[PDB]
């Protein structure tokens, strides 16, 4: 396997940080003007995170179009994903209003509400079935319909209702919920196993709008959820299996959104679910 050659001699050269810095220059840099406008600023969880205006998604609703959220299309890959940050208590909302307008089947979530001591994202799901929530500004309902609680893991199914027009959508929520406070998992096995539970759901197939997917940024565990995804599938879908470059691939993917894989170690956590993940599909 090439990957994993590339792989052991990064590490036995410790060259990730030079590796990682590396992407990091030859990344794009495009516009972000409409995440700075004033009217946005409390839209925007992060100072320096912020979606380009080529890519971002715009809100339907008229007012203020704007989300701090990305559509990164991966052509040959032909797959979708809406990269966005955890939402705000102001931004729940609009959050929904998303969903519901790009008619996604699934939200992944890489992050606890709560991690080393501080909220990284709203209590944007209800965690009742009793107890639905309901977003005035954006006039939509959201019914907590059923959880399935695993060790690594939460899957809930939820009603999304257009109270406007009542109509109703079943979104599955996969919660990924042992990422380590600090650092990367110390074995990709349960974040592939998430993965494919995810695609099990069609929640990634093209059936269905792209799929939703956060942690605090909406760039870090997500650039590495996503990545990962993607190179899979590039696997599967060419003539040479190894022709396919997590680096290449990566670099791809930041013309859509910036600064996906925030670390060294997140970049040697994707080729390790890339290189694990090949074994189990191709293998
Ligand atoms: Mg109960």
């Not at 099990?200 to 605090?216: A, D, I, K, N, Y």
């Not at 940024?217 to 590039?234: E, K, M, V």
């Not at 396919?244 to 930041?254: A, N, P, S």
Request: glycine share 4%.
């Amino acid at each position: 396997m090439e990957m994993e050659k590339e792989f052991e001699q990064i590490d036995k050269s410790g060259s990730w940080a030079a590796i990682y810095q590396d992407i990091r220059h030859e990344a794009s840099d495009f516009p972000c003007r409409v995440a700075k406008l004033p009217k946005n600023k409390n839209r925007n969880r992060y100072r320096d995170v912020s979606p380009f205006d080529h890519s971002r998604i715009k809100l339907h609703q008229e007012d203020n179009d704007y989300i701090n959220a990305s559509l990164i299309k991966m052509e040959e890959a032909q797959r979708s994903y809406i990269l966005t940050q955890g939402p705000l208590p102001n931004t729940c909302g609009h959050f929904w209003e998303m969903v519901w307008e790009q008619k996604s089947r699934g939200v992944v979530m890489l992050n606890r509400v709560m991690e080393k001591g501080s909220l990284k994202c709203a209590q944007y799901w209800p965690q009742k079935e009793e107890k639905e929530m309901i977003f005035e500004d954006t006039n939509l309902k959201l019914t907590l319909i059923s959880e399935d609680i695993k060790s690594y893991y939460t899957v809930r199914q939820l009603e999304l209702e257009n109270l406007t027009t009542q109509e109703t959508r079943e979104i599955l929520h996969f919660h990924y919920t042992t990422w380590p406070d600090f650092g990367v998992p110390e074995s990709p096995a349960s974040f592939l196993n998430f993965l494919f539970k995810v695609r099990e759901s069609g929640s990634l197939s093209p059936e269905h709008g792209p799929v939703v997917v956060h942690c605090s940024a909406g760039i870090g565990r997500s650039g590495t959820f996503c990545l990962a995804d993607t190179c899979l599938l590039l696997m599967d879908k060419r003539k040479d299996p190894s022709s396919v470059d997590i680096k290449k691939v990566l670099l791809e993917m930041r013309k859509f959104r910036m600064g996906l894989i925030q670390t060294a170690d997140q970049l040697r956590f994707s080729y390790l679910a890339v290189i694990e993940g090949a074994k189990f599909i191709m293998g």
